[PDB]
Design a protein around this ligand. Sequence first.
Ligand SMILES: Nc1ncnc2c1ncn2[C@@H]1O[C@H](COP(=O)(O)OP(=O)(O)O)[C@@H](O)[C@H]1O
Ligand SMILES: Nc1ncnc2c1ncn2[C@@H]1O[C@H](COP(=O)(O)OP(=O)(O)O)[C@@H](O)[C@H]1O
Ligand SMILES: Nc1ncnc2c1ncn2[C@@H]1O[C@H](COP(=O)(O)OP(=O)(O)O)[C@@H](O)[C@H]1O
Lengths: 239, 735
Amino acid sequence: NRPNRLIVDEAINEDNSVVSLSQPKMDELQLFRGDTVLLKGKKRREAVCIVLSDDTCSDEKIRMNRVVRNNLRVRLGDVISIQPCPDVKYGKRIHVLPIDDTVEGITGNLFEVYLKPYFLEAYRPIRKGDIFLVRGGMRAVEFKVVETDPSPYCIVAPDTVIHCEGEPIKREDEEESLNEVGYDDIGGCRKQLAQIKEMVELPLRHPALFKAIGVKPPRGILLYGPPGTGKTLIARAVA
Amino acid sequence: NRPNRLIVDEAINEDNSVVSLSQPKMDELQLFRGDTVLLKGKKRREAVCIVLSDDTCSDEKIRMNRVVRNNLRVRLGDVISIQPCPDVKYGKRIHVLPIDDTVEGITGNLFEVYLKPYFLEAYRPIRKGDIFLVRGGMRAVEFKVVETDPSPYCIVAPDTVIHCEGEPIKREDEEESLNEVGYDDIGGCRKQLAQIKEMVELPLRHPALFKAIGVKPPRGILLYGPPGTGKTLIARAVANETGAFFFLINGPEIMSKLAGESESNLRKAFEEAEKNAPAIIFIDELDAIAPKREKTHGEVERRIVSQLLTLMDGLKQRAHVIVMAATNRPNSIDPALRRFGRFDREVDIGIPDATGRLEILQIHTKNMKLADDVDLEQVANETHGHVGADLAALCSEAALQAIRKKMDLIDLEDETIDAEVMNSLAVTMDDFRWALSQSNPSALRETVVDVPQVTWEDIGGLEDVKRELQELVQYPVEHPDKFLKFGMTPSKGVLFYGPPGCGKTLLAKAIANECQANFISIKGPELLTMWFGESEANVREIFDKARQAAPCVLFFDELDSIAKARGGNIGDGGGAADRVINQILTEMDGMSTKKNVFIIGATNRPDIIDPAILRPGRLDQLIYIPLPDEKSRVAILKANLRKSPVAKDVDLEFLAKMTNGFSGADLTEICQRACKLAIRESIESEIVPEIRRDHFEEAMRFARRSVSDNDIRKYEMFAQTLQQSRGFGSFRFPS
Ligand SMILES: Nc1ncnc2c1ncn2[C@@H]1O[C@H](COP(=O)(O)OP(=O)(O)O)[C@@H](O)[C@H]1O
Ligand SMILES: Nc1ncnc2c1ncn2[C@@H]1O[C@H](COP(=O)(O)OP(=O)(O)O)[C@@H](O)[C@H]1O
Ligand SMILES: Nc1ncnc2c1ncn2[C@@H]1O[C@H](COP(=O)(O)OP(=O)(O)O)[C@@H](O)[C@H]1O
């Protein structure tokens, strides 16, 4: 059954480039703990991150964060093929710049405030064309890789230096804005959010499944609770 | 009279090619049991099937299924000529293909999934041009015969092989779609569906009969019941199975229009169906159409109500249309529509029982398969407060959860699903039990009507009372001649008084199962709710519900509950009269004594009962239930220990002896406590599967009698005062 494809799931860690996998799952690939793992999903984009350890997730699934889901253009309930890449790679020339939608109203240097306390003692394989978000400065800032040395063989290292011009770019509709709501913005609602997740996944992720079969999917989903609980937040996140 | 033509009827078997006939009917044709029978109806189509045996259908009729009715283009209430055909015929070349309306979204092979497990060891004479439906793959699939070897002399056999091209065809309006509703989609509704069947057959199947005669057929047929019972399902089935045009009028659809247009829609909805006579006009809901009870608001609402009223009584024959309506709340209809000529027939359909609910599960799961450990008998017991629509959602959720459990890690990234996996998808107990927890019943506050399954074998002792009850409610209903000849009226009701716990509720429940009648139970707090709420008019609906549900029995538990709430033995500044019992007394005077209804009153304090109910015409028969004796207590325990297998060393005859003031209910908690010990010790020793003697010995320490010792003499002194059979011992005459 080609045991190299796993189903995605929401991550429990607050870090950006972290992949959560179980101990029994990790030995099936015959791989080590501290390394770089390559992820191939759909839409001919690739993703490489750092794999971690888990012990309570499931029998066979992958837990990946929201920022790394945007690079692969994949969503919850989708299958992705994972393959290892045990090769040593460094970085020589890195050219990145943020988008004006998040750096509008910010002056001064853009290196010692967001680029230095982000990549220190991290060793993250930043791939070309990836979009990552940095948290700090009591606001949300996201960057993008425009051009660099030809990928692969690109990892941020202290030997290389970062340079930026200063002018932003214009984004398109191909990528999804990280400022929108998601599954990581819901707290406390664990038992009740799962019912909505399972009631909506089938009739949306597989529209053709219900079109052929005669099973009647639920139409109306009425929400309750005192004002301010987040009924609109859940409705927007599940969409 | 050419005894070869029989009337059609619905089949009771779930098989497709089965013809049901009685044993006396079968010898009239001089034919054998296992063979092929030829049926000739109308429209120059023929049909051949396999005849079976029956013993409870009728004197002379044929019972045939719905799929075989479509081939002959015949409906219920039609005559068909049957003739035998004793000739051996085989099959050589068969070419069949389904229609795209049912195989849209299915890929893979179409032979080993639906054609092989359909014709094996069957030997069905499939005729050319016939349409048959196959059930499987958790969906409905139907095929059709396009061309083959020239009929007759065509029977499917293992020697021949089946071939299919792959491209579908396009159907026409000549054949009726099997995906529509029918008479086989109704479960539990047996007594009430027959009234609609007989009320609609004559004015639709024979429109010319009523056109020549002056008999006035019923026009309006109002439907009742909580939402989800299937009022629309019945309305569509009776229109599809009678060949009449069905028109659906939604409640909010009229209201969604602006001023004037909503008025025009109702007017234009009548002559449109008039030209297509016969026709049936159905109204979805009437709460949002004519809520003229306390609204008294809006200028267009009254205009719409009056337009509907004028369109009701304005049907001066002309066509042969029958108008039907459905309302969930019987009390939410204006009396103007209830007048004669608009709505004179009322049908009240209630929540089905366990037997009725099991048929709903069988109906809604006929297209899907189930595992061997899957039984629908258990799920029909815990869903006591579920409506017929709740079971459809329950089975749909059970089917859906299977996909999320078995088709979660597969991730078949395909544009169209296959059939070799969908058929193999089975549903187990773990799928249904999860759906039971998530299901929320929508009908748990209304008064449910059910026939209890308790018989006289479950009541221990009290043999003297049973004969008195069997001789009071069963003779006037089954020997009316001896009551009409003497001219003396039967008794109205009976009163049960005595110490609590003797099982007065069981006596009322057992008499309902023997008489094959309904049973309505009212508890104590149900009466106090109206007394505290200052609304005594709610009992009128309770009385009216029992009337239409004939035959029925009425039960009133602890009628003295209101008297105890105002002082009890000491009473208060007033008398023994209140407002709840006043309405019951007023309604018992106006109720018809000729109906198959009965009222049973239960009480435990006869000293506080209002004497206004004992005077002749309301309640005269008083039955006293004394304390159980030693010989009667053995039977109580024997009947109680029937649900759970017990050992042989349990000497119940000994337990009967030391029990002196223990009532019938005083022994149930003893058995419950003894049974709890077995579970406790099994779970404790898990880290044996039979009840032991020592369990009953331990339960004797907590033997608490619910009745005291001072009130025992009060019942005896009351009974001896009421009877007083002293003085006149034995008198004789000199000659
Ligand atoms: N459970 C929650 N978790 C995170 N944020 C929340 C939650 N509930 C409410 N909020 C925040 O409160 C703001 C207002 O929410 P609101 O529209 O009032 O929710 P609702 O429509 O359910 O009352 C939103 O912008 C949302 O970010
Ligand atoms: N007694 C029943 N037997 C079979 N199916 C039923 C029954 N009652 C309801 N259903 C199913 O429930 C669905 C919804 O019915 P609904 O329109 O709510 O009935 P009503 O209009 O009487 O409330 C229908 O598609 C029908 O198939
Ligand atoms: N004579 C009897 N035979 C068998 N079981 C009895 C008898 N009397 C009472 N019970 C059991 O005791 C239980 C409680 O009855 P209860 O409601 O106290 O009766 P009542 O309302 O007449 O006092 C019932 O479930 C019934 O099974």
